[PDB]
């Protein structure tokens, strides 16, 4: 009986981290979902808009 | 028949620690049992929660 209260906790704590670590991936995906799409935007407007510009 | 007394006393007396021995040796497998499964369970457990959450 005082096992079983250590091992309650446990796996308390256990799907505690768990769900700590599923919020994260998450955030993190998010994350490089939108620094990818930022880097094509600016990088791929900039160099259009300089070139055509120039050549006309 | 003091004889006779005597060996229906020790007859009754051998029974009954061949009694007590069995009921010994089912608690005493019972907990070999229980302890072989707590092992397995919770190296198996920690080991694989703390390694497969740091590689990813």
């Given at each position: ?40 935007l600016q990088q791929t407007l900039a160099a ?9």
């Amino acid at each position: 009986r005082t096992m079983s209260e250590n091992l309650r906790r446990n796996l308390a704590a256990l799907e505690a981290k768990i769900s700590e670590a599923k919020t994260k991936k998450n955030m993190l995906q998010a994350r490089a979902k939108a620094a990818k799409a930022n880097a094509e935007l600016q990088q791929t407007l900039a160099a259009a808009a300089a070139a055509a510009a120039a050549a006309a």
